[PDB]
Symmetry: C2
Subunit: 310 residues, 2 copies
């Protein structure tokens, strides 16, 4: 069991039973903080690169481009260093010194865009760079790349099936790209044949999944639950496998993350608080009382030292 | 495989082969960042509490006291929250806002001592608090508690034996308390019966182990390799099982940590750089060319965002 590089070491993350949430320990959490770049995104950082290698879109010498300073940026950075690709990430010049320092530490070629342009700035610049030399550059596109949900169908999902001896009844996961919930749901529902309840979680400030499914007006909005609530339906969210959508507000998510640390001794990030707040709600409905609820905790605390988490 | 709390989830950390260090991949690293509080100390945080429970020194209602704002502080904090003990940590008032915030996040009762007194301040204050109510307080004493090396003999060591199919020839580990090298060495040498080479690593700025073994004047000194080089021989370092002592300087350790991130895609902290720099040195001596070298990487990068690592 010696991994030939850090990318192969993804996953096999642990399940812990919660003591101050749910009912008689029906709530259990999967700690995605225990990963090479310390997020769930490592799995997709790994698989998007492996897949682009296998299909020939990524070769020796070609470079990777993207516009993320978030978990996927960090995940891509680790894999690119492990596998010998130069990576360019674009980002607004206004980004935090800390993620600048972290990414520079990882050997990212950081391309800072105009502040005013913000996120749009970064996306366009990466698109421009790709155009400048299409044969030299590859954009992996986490929001639409099937290698994203696929890795979850082959690792994250089966790990849940195995650790719970097939007793998992509910999976609760916050949606960013949608990959986690999609892959996990396909694995357990389709490969293992169990009719679990798949629960997507989004910010009440930006409940575009709920609005879309209700045929209501789509109203995205600002929120602090980093990692989720992109403000649109990403292609990597398979609406067909979602059974329920729960909304959580920023304050509840933050306080719940604090409770996880202070009461459970679990070092979870902002979105982990949101996912658990929603799981706790279902766990306390008599319909879910006797049912095993597994919650994805996407990331670790520390990464949020500069945020409202603290 | 559902852990009844976060303390039971320690270890099972992965081995990764290095590509830009050693010779033909003879250097392999154990990533202790993949742990509940994100350090190697989690194992001892867990075991010191479990052991004090089993022997009756820790009971319901009793409180834990210590004087650490470092990895052991964080580890104790996670376990105490997971298992329902109030924890008091003392520390100089001059400590970083960030570790203050992190520990407060974990529900530590933080007792800040006079700045001028520094470390000595914290130790004395905790000793005072214990004296104030001996029946209410317990100090676990990481430097001398046998539960420290023991956990390494039962988990860390056997994990190395198992992952390498008994092929490990050399273990390289930096010494703080000495628990890691001690426990691992006892496991492989005594329980498995293989005559490996145990290599302790200390800062060249504070090479008290080397000086002591050479019968030279002991000259502890300041350094930046956080986690190691306490400036004395701790009781939890079993000198009898150490075969070799390697010294590394602060700059080399830092640059090596940077290389691990930028070239290997491994998010290691300062002491990981020191441990690898020393492993790389042995790995490039013909006597160790054909031999499998396993290096403990005690902690993850991010924890060092405010340091010279970046």
């Amino acid at each position: 069991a010696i991994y030939a590089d850090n990318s192969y070491s993804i996953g096999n993350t642990p399940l812990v039973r919660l003591k101050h949430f749910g009912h008689n320990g029906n709530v259990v959490v999967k700690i995605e903080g225990r990963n090479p770049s310390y997020s769930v995104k490592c799995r997709i950082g790994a698989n998007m690169v492996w897949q682009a290698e296998k299909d020939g879109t990524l070769t020796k010498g070609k470079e990777i481009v993207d516009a993320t300073s978030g978990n996927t940026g960090i995940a891509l950075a680790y894999v690119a260093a492990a596998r010998g690709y130069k990576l360019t990430l674009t980002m607004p010049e206004t980004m935090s010194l800390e993620r600048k320092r972290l990414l520079c530490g990882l050997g990212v070629n950081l391309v800072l865009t105009e502040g005013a342009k913000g996120m749009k700035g970064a996306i366009a610049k990466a698109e421009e760079i790709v155009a400048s030399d299409p044969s030299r550059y590859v954009m992996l596109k986490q929001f639409e790349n099937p290698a994203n949900p696929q890795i979850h169908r082959e690792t994250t999902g089966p790990e849940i099936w195995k650790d719970t001896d097939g007793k998992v009844d509910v999976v609760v996961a916050g949606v960013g790209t949608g990959g986690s919930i999609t892959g996990i749901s396909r694995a357990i529902k389709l490969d293992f044949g169990k009719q679990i309840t798949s629960v997507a979680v989004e910010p009440v400030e930006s409940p575009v999944i709920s609005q879309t499914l209700a045929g209501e007006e789509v109203k995205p909005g600002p929120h602090k639950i980093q990692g989720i609530g992109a403000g649109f339906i990403p292609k990597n969210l398979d609406l067909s496998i979602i059974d329920r959508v729960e909304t959580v507000d920023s304050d509840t998510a933050l306080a719940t993350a604090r409770r996880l640390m202070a009461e459970e001794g679990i070092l979870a990030g902002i979105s982990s608080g949101a996912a658990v707040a929603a799981a706790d709600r279902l766990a306390k409905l008599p319909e879910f009382a006797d049912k095993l609820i597994v919650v994805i905790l996407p990331s670790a605390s520390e990464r949020y030292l500069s945020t409202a988490l603290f």
